[PDB]
Design a protein around this ligand. Structure first.
Ligand SMILES: Cc1cc2nc3c(=O)[nH]c(=O)nc-3n(C[C@H](O)[C@H](O)[C@H](O)COP(=O)(O)O)c2cc1C
Ligand SMILES: Cc1cc2nc3c(=O)[nH]c(=O)nc-3n(C[C@H](O)[C@H](O)[C@H](O)COP(=O)(O)O)c2cc1C
Lengths: 438, 437
């Protein structure tokens, strides 16, 4: 049907199920960096886009839904991020409720460690038996995971004790709960690898045998993909669809500042490094960020090293304490904590007043939200503090398109770079088959 | 025709130039772990083998050359490691001199940060002008590198100020130095591991810039222990590949049976990083076998102490007692005295003046000692064995689990090489057909 080589790549049922032309998804990016504009542009070009709900209010998310639906008037598929946080399980439930009320039938579920009541409610709500014997699934889930045991949890049906409970509470009907037993929690697993693939594929096959699901759950890959070569490698290793992230932040459509994008355009492969994440600061979770020309990585790492050794804010020696206040924060510890009193819940403050360790993290965490805010806002002339999440994939992309019309991010459109990546990926793949069988 | 699928992989001129059937090399492994016997077995099977000269005497290396040549009597190609050390600059020069004096026309050049006088001497010596105006290159170099700027240095001709100097000193003739201007430093770059596709563009850029007659190929090494890994490398544009870890666990490898017994049981997750002896101070790290072994933690500890204190005395008596009793089984004083016997007066002199260097020198004993423990079959305590190894071996082990190849005593370096390349070829063709169908 006039479909290009790029469109032939990856699993056919994946493309059919989501009514898309490419086995390709743009991954969520928090605080709307994966913007309404981006999701709309991706949907209209026949690929999968997810809106970045991370760290936005329910009211704001609902506003995003309305805008996207209004612009998508040919039944184009699109998705919403559902980002798990250990501390705020009610935000997730409220997000699901918003999704159910507003027609959201596709989510990217990420950072989950296992299956939650909210996910089960979403998966099972609306389930009905078709006359032809099949299960009518209203609400689809693409689970983004890095760990086999989380993948496995998603390849299994909704756990029975959660269903039983939700039926008791009249959240699900017995019929919905019965139907939920014979389908997996996720329709697709996006394996995020920022060598794991064959293990996940073997795990998938085992789970298909074990449960005898009617429809195969596909396994895709994301992480490190910014070039035709990287994408080709992912498909060789068994990816049945692929996802990108870093390259999409550096486009016209991305919901971040022009200054951020200017920085991102100049990134090379070596220009990123690891730094702690705000929302998982204590645990020691780390994420990749832009390094070249920026102080944030060193500074964020420093604050973790101080949390690590001392047990309170007072314990910090006055010379570094003066460093943090004057250079990092441009604010005193006291000033920060008082600002935090305004923002946070009384319960959280109370918890900090009793615990000097928690009070410390709480104050350092301000740096992360502050620097994120600085980045999103175009304003600061000092770019030195900008927290910018980014992997080497972008660096690779930049080198790929060096000296091209695509070099300037103002000519980079999320749907077009997506298309070109997939078409060139396809050509590269075919070209190699020519080479080795010649 | 009559070439297997495995032999078709990679760049054809790479295979032609080195008169081999596979675009495949076994990497050097120090102290003769890449043994004469291994290099011979690889050469006879139409692949590239490099002898592990690292940490051996010039006399020992010269003896290795003789043994290898005698067994290779059909003009089979083989190579020698040239391992750069910042502080043994004369060993390199003497190694080059030995290579020139003997039949060595191929080296694997590794750990170089840029181009040195010794490398230029090697490259430029044999040079002759061909009748057609082209440069006849006698002495070939495969540069193993991780950094773009080092690769670039190798993709460039011998730097002019080094040539000019060597001519002045009558090490090179003006003719040799002239010819050297129009050929690159290396014939091949083995990129040691997203860097892959980047390096290829850099190569192309350098080809355009200098218009070399022969293309410099770009290959890949690191993490390759299975058909999948090897298939991925070629798909990503590798024009040849090199392996290391999988070869240490073969009959031919020059290390102890007990080391190989440990290696046979390795899984992907059973390795970690530890500092390297020869580049201890700089903070260079290398991958080693971890599971069941104390060496990694202990080697790391010693670096943390070098990092922090500025002398041996400064170490608190409780950790000082740990190191002496458990790590070394010897006192600091006993070690230093042993070192006086071994090392050059010049090195002792430097330690006597500098307490920082004296410390490293003493900690470095641990590395040479544990390396020796591994090479020798003897110690029943395997706990201190320094064994270099990456996850590639773990992957290989899982690949051959429950097969005749499971026992390392049935693992031959040439045969696992062949099998890897043949299966790599089959995997690529079968999957590319599937994926583009
Ligand atoms: C700036 C940025 C923000 C991101 N935010 C989220 C997020 O909020 N939730 C989520 O599940 N993934 C998030 N991701 C991950 C991407 O969706 C995608 O999975 C990942 O970036 C793929 O890795 P790659 O950049 O190497 O292509 C984010 C990535 C970036 C670069
Ligand atoms: C035990 C061992 C010793 C090695 N010794 C050297 C060496 O002396 N000089 C060198 O350039 N590379 C040395 N290497 C690196 C290998 O030549 C090869 O490049 C590398 O192991 C390939 O990575 P892989 O193990 O993932 O296959 C050594 C590797 C191992 C495993």
């Amino acid at each position: 049907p006039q479909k290009t080589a790029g469109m032939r790549l990856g699993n056919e049922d994946f493309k059919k199920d989501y009514n898309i032309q490419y086995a390709y998804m743009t991954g969520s990016m928090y605080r709307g960096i994966a913007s309404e504009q981006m999701v709309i542009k991706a949907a209209k070009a026949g690929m999968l886009g997810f809106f970045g709900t991370g760290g936005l209010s329910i009211e704001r998310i609902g506003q995003a839904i309305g805008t996207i639906r209004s612009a998508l008037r040919q039944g184009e598929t699109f998705g919403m991020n559902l980002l798990h946080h250990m501390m705020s399980p009610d935000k997730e439930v409220r997000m699901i409720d918003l999704y159910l009320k507003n027609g959201i039938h596709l989510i990217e579920a990420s950072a989950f460690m296992g299956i939650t009541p909210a996910l089960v409610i979403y998966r099972a709500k609306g389930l009905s038996r078709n006359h032809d014997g099949s299960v009518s699934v209203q609400n689809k889930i693409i689970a983004k995971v890095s760990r086999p045991e989380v993948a496995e949890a998603f390849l299994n049906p909704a756990p029975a004790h959660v269903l039983e409970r939700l039926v008791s509470d009249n959240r699900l009907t017995a019929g919905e709960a019965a139907l939920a037993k014979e389908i997996p929690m996720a329709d697709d697993i996006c394996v995020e690898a920022d060598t794991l693939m064959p293990a996940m594929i073997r795990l998938r096959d085992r789970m298909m045998e074990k449960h005898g699901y009617a429809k195969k759950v596909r396994i895709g890959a994301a992480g490190g993909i910014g070039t035709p070569e990287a994408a080709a490698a992912a498909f060789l290793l068994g990816a049945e669809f692929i996802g990108t992230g870093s390259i999409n932040q550096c486009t016209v459509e991305a919901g971040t500042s022009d200054s951020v994008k200017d920085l991102l355009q100049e990134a090379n492969v070596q220009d990123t490094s690891y730094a702690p994440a705000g929302d998982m600061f204590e645990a020691g979770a780390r994420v990749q960020v832009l390094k070249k020309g920026l102080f944030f990585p060193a500074r964020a790492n420093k604050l973790f090293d101080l949390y690590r050794q001392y047990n309170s804010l007072d314990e910090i020696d006055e010379k570094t304490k003066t460093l943090i206040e004057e250079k990092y924060f441009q604010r005193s510890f006291e000033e920060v904590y008082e600002q935090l009193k305004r923002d946070k819940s009384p319960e959280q403050i109370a918890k900090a007043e009793q615990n000097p360790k928690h009070k410390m993290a709480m104050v350092f965490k301000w740096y992360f939200s502050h620097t994120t805010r600085l980045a999103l806002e175009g304003k600061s002339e000092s770019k030195i503090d900008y927290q910018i999440h980014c992997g080497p994939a972008l660096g690779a992309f930049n080198q790929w398109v060096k000296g091209t019309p695509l070099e300037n991010w103002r000519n980079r459109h999320v749907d077009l770079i997506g298309k070109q990546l997939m078409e060139e990926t396809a050509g590269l793949l075919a070209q190699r088959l020519v080479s080795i069988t010649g």
